[PDB]
Amino acid sequence: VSIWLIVFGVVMGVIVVGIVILIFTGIRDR
Amino acid sequence: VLPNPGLDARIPSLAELETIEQEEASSRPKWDNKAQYMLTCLGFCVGLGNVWRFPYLCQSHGGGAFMIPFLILLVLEGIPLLYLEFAIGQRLRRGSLGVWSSIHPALKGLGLASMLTSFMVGLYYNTIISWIMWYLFNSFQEPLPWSDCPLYVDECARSSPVDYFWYRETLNISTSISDSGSIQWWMLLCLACAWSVLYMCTIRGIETTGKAVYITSTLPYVVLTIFLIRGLTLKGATNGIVFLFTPNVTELAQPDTWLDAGAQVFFSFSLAFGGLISFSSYNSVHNNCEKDSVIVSIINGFTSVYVAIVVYSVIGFRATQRYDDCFSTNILTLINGFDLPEGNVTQENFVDMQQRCNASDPAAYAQLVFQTCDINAFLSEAVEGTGLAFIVFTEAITKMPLSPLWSVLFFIMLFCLGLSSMFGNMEGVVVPLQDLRVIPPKWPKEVLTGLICLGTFLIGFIFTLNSGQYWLSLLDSYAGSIPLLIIAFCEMFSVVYVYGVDRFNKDIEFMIGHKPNIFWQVTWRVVSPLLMLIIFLFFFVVEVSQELTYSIWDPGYEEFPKSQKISYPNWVYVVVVIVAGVPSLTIPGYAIYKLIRNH
Ligand SMILES: *[C@@H]1O[C@H](CO)[C@@H](O[C@@H]2O[C@H](CO)[C@@H](O)[C@H](O)[C@H]2NC(C)=O)[C@H](O)[C@H]1NC(C)=O
Ligand SMILES: *[C@@H]1O[C@H](CO)[C@@H](O)[C@H](O)[C@H]1NC(C)=O
């Protein structure tokens, strides 16, 4: 399954989760 | 000294700096610790340069002798300019475009160039990080994918699997810059991942990076250490170290030595980018920036050589392997030729046994073919740039037990180095924009950060083309040349002859409760300006002494293994003017526009 691709997927998942919460805190500033 | 009036108004007063920090608590960011500032500045200086540029120059330019110039310009210009950059940012309470515009309005070109230079360097450093994390994802296979030949490709059969995994499996490289093709999807995927990881770390700003910088500046040192204690157990490691520090005193008497030694101090210190100025402007007004510039330069001089010890330990092990393997092949040739008992012929008695065999059977011996085996030749096969990581270090790792582990640790380290450098370059592009108020003051800074990330991502599609490695070797060759030095010469000039070093040293007196020693004054007046000029004159004595010739891969034609090299098309001088003249002619260009808008 081209492990590299599986590693790409998991890494992207972590990054997207991180940026999502980051932008969330961006709107969560009250 | 130069008569600029109204300058006083452009800058805040020294009496008003005691009250400005209790009101810039809101509407300006602040470091959480001093460690968070020092680690973000060490991270900006330290990068893949000192991994595959500094160690190569340290040997190619007189070995031990090259250290003399490196340190010379390091203390004559590196430290002096660094101090000037930290102090001017902490005093005038703005980033790079802010500082130069205030020193004098026509100095706006300085910020524009610094912003243009940070955009072009960060554009190609994020393609290199794209490639690093492609090799990190492929590091989860017991037989690493650059370990064996694809069943066997004639191209791959020639040279080695590693040389095949980089130019074909990873690059799908063409044979010319005139040959562009299709976006390599996996390469684009990795480019996406690189820009995405950068946004998460720089989305908010120095605050978000402040957390990431720690690990991106810590992990590298831990891993670099783990590598030294492993490197020095691999046989032949010392051969490489000794090789790095053999002094060729004749290479000191060359105009090409002191230019590279000069250009290395400037890129290694992240000077003339502006990010450093922005980082310093967030400290307290009474922060000691004289002690900070000495500590950061001391760590940069020690890291530079410390990484060169780790690199040449691997070069020495890899060459000791090659040499031994070739010698073994030569021995097997003789034993197979004369049916000699195995173990009878040895590396020590091979020559005499060779003579005895030739004496016994000259005809048979004549048929026998023996390869040339010189450790020095293998030692002098070290590649400069990405080749050292993807072609040399990747192959030495496959000949090491726990191979995948070592590969993984090696790629997370390069990732961390590159990412810390990216924090600096991003700081250099975002802060000037806000100075221009480009972003609607409505849209949060995160919006601007994403815009910058997504805009630089779309331009980075040029390096995912089949010819994308030829573009990157050209941009890289003309991204840190004269422009960086030019910007650095005018920052020095503008603080000393336009804003006056008198105010500078006085402002220094106000912040560190004392004025700088004669050293700083002298360097900022003659030592730095004069020395930089001779580096500027060397450029048109060496760049003119060279030609626009770039190496190509070309699986077929000539000798595949041989590094086939071709010239550049006539339209490339348009690209070199864009990557050289543009970031060096906005400094006069804006200064001619502003002097004829008033008149
Ligand atoms: C350092 O390296 C240079 C380059 O190899 C040496 O210069 C050579 O000197 C010999 C002897 O005079 C000449 O035959 C070569 O033609 C020279 N090569 C070049 C490229 O000029 C130099 O002698 C070396 N010296 C030290 C101190 O190691
Ligand atoms: C890129 O890869 C494709 C196959 O996916 C191949 O047809 C093409 O020739 C390659 N281009 C270069 C220049 O290597």
Q: Between A3, A4, A22, which is nearest B200 by CB?
A: A22
Nearest CA in chain A to B188: A8
Write the CB contacts of B440 (distance below 8 Å, at least 6 apart in sequence). none
Experimental method: cryo-EM
- Residue B127 CB less than 6 A away from ligand 2: no
Alpha-helix runs per DSSP H in B138-205: 154-157, 161-164, 185-202
In chain B, what are the domain boundaries? 1-599
Nearest CA in chain B to A21: B200
Q: Which of A3, A4, A29 to mutate: most B Cβ within 10 Å?
A: A4
Q: SS3 for B429-459, per residue?
A: HHHHHHHCCCCCCCCCHHHHHHHHHHHHHHH
Nearest CA in chain B to A23: B446
Residues 219-258 of B with CB under 8 A from A: none
* CA distance readout (Å), B469 to B117, B296, B354, B550: 20, 33, 46, 11
Resolution, angstroms, 1 dp:
2.8
Q: Which of B182, B185, B188, B560 to mutate to test the pocket of ligand 2 (most atoms within 8 A of CB)?
A: B182
Q: Which of B559, B549, B572, B497 is nearest to B528 (CA)?
A: B497
Tokens (6 digits) for B511: 């912040």
Question: How much distance in Å is there from the Cα of B169 to the middle of ligand 2?
Answer: 10
Q: Do B200 and A19 touch (CB under 8 A)?
A: yes
A5 touches chain B (CB under 8 A): yes
Q: Do A11 and B200 touch (CB under 8 A)?
A: no
- Written as one string, the DSSP assignment of B36-99 is HHHHHHHHHH-SSHHHHTHHHHHHHTTTHHHHHHHHHHIIIIIHHHHHHHHHHHHHH-S-HHHH
Phi first, then psi, for residue B551 (nearest 5°) are: -75, 150
Residues of chain A with C-beta less than 8 angstroms from the C-beta of B208: 22
Phi first, then psi, for residue B90 (nearest 5°) are: -75, -30
| Burial (CB count <10 Å: 0-12, 13-18, 19+), residue B154 | exposed
Write the CB contacts of B569 (distance below 8 Å, at least 6 apart in sequence). B177, B178
Q: Do B444 and A26 touch (CB under 8 A)?
A: yes
Write the CB contacts of B467 (distance below 8 Å, at least 6 apart in sequence). B173, B174, B176, B177, B178, B179, B180, B181
Atom of ligand 1 nearest to the CA of B249: 27
Measured distance CA(B533)–CA(B396) in Å, rounded:
41
Task: Return the residue matching tokens 């040499």.
Answer: B323
How many angstroms away from the CA of B408 is the closest CA of chain A?
12
Q: SS3 for B201-255, per residue?
A: HHCCCHHHHHHHHHHHHHHHHHHHHHHHHHHCCCCCHHHHHHHHCCCCHHHHHCH
For CA atoms B289, B484, B434, B216, the dihedral sign is negative
Q: Taking CB atoms and an 8 Å cut-off, how many pairs form between chains A and B?
A: 47
Tokens (6 digits) for B194: 């690189």
Measured distance CA(B464)–CA(B314) in Å, rounded:
30
Q: Which of B151, B156, B157 is nearest to B169 (CA)?
A: B156
